[PDB]
């Protein structure tokens, strides 16, 4: 009458600092994306960053800079399906 094999849950991790934040969330960006502007966000916030100023203007643009650009087809700075086995 028992069943659950679970690992250790030994989630700790010896790194450093991170030095790239939101500008949405402010938690952190590990893997953010980047714009024709340069400031990177989270492939997730930015999506709902855009319909934020689309009930309002309708058009998105940065949170931080505001620039003048295309929100669609935007691309980070490596987009690789290679992942290490
Ligand atoms: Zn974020
Ligand atoms: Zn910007």
Same mark, same amino acid.
């Given at each position: ?12 991790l010896?790194n450093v600092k991170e030095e790239v934040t939101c500008?949405?969330c =402010?938690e952190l960006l590990t893997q953010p994306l980047? #714009? !024709?502007? $340069?400031?990177s966000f989270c492939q997730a %916030? =930015? ?7 689309? #009930? !309002?203007? $309708? ?5 931080? %800079? ?10 980070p700075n ?8």
């Amino acid at each position: 009458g028992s069943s659950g094999s679970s690992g250790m849950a030994s989630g700790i991790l010896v790194n450093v600092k991170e030095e790239v934040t939101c500008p949405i969330c =402010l938690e952190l960006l590990t893997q953010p994306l980047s #714009l !024709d502007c $340069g400031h990177s966000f989270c492939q997730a %916030c =930015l999506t709902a960053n855009h319909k934020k100023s689309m #009930l !309002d203007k $309708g058009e998105s643009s940065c949170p931080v %800079c505001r620039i003048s650009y295309q929100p669609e087809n935007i691309r980070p700075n490596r987009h690789v399906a290679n992942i290490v086995e």
